[PDB]
């Protein structure tokens, strides 16, 4: 099996680089964040613009959905995160504490917590209701590029330009593992596999790696794309064939067979770096987004 992703929609509207796209867990919406300080919401199936959510004072680097699809959190150069009620557009809470740009963010599966990573080299864990910082982890010695909860919220994985992936106990704030292979290029992205067994890590040497968390060993290596400069999102696609999906600095979306490591498709159309990709929770749909000289989001659909 190889997928057959075909371009369905191009979503135009952001006036600067798009930074992150994410599908809502209920599958109904796509959220995009941008350097233009805005979050936009679009229909996942029809690509139709829904609304703009605004409030940050500088550009946004990341956005994430709560499990019930009703809240968003965004991470901004204004050094804050904001929690938003999507239906009302209200900023419920502004999460203050970071001392430099906030780069990445995610809700835990229960969605009572938010994890953030910053250029201040810390990872913070926040309470969603109170907006209070619960924990500040001395996570890394360079900007934190990604943070992600595993499927039961018990672990956080973080990555940094310092070349390390670290795994944290959500409950204690304790570092449970540091992952490093045979070199330490900047790690520009990390995330847990849906089943929580693996971590997918991007490094700025044009390489993606699949790590077995428990064994602390690299199992798979994916290459062929270009990634030396930007923190590009990568994904596990699981709705059809089991793929790895990533953007690339040659303006393509790359799709690999997870087990064989072969490139199975390259999606063409963007005119600048594909900084973000996201996979729909139930259907074979990929969203991709590009930087300043493109400014668009694309939705692609496949039979498998």
């Amino acid at each position: 099996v190889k997928p057959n992703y075909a371009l369905k929609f191009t979503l135009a509207g952001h006036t600067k680089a798009v930074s992150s796209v994410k599908f809502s867990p209920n599958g109904e919406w796509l959220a995009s964040s941008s350097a233009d300080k805005l979050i936009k919401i679009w229909g996942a199936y029809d690509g139709k613009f829904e609304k703009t959510i605004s409030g940050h004072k500088l550009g946004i680097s990341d956005v994430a959905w709560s499990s019930d699809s009703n809240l968003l959190v965004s991470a901004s150069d204004d050094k804050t995160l904001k929690i938003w009620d999507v239906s009302s557009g209200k900023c419920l809470k502004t999460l203050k504490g970071h001392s430099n740009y906030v780069f990445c963010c995610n809700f835990n599966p229960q969605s009572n917590l938010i994890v953030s990573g910053s250029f201040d080299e810390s990872v913070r864990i926040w309470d969603v209701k109170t907006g209070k910082c619960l924990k500040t982890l001395p996570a890394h010695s360079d900007p934190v590029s990604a943070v992600h909860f595993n499927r039961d919220g018990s672990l956080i994985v973080s990555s940094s330009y310092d070349g390390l992936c670290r795994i944290w106990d959500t409950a204690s704030g304790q570092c449970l593992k540091t992952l490093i292979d045979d070199d330490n290029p900047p790690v520009s992205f990390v995330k847990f596999s849906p089943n929580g067994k693996y971590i997918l890590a991007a490094t700025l040497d044009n390489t993606l790696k699949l790590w077995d968390y428990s064994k602390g060993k690299c199992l798979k290596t994916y290459t062929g794309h270009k990634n030396e400069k930007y923190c590009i999102f990568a994904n596990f696609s699981v709705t059809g064939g089991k793929w790895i999906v990533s953007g690339s600095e040659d303006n393509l979306v790359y799709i690999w067979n997870l087990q064989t490591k072969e490139i199975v498709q390259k999606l063409q159309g963007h005119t600048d770096v594909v900084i973000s990709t996201a996979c729909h929770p139930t259907e074979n749909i990929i969203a991709s987004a590009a930087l300043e000289n493109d400014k668009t989001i694309k939705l692609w659909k496949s039979d498998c």
Partner: peptide, 16 residues
């Protein structure tokens, strides 16, 4: 006049 380098977001810039 607009600023020469409109502030965007860290993800859209290259960090050395």
């Amino acid at each position: 006049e607009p600023p020469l380098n409109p502030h965007g977001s860290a993800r859209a810039e290259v960090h050395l």
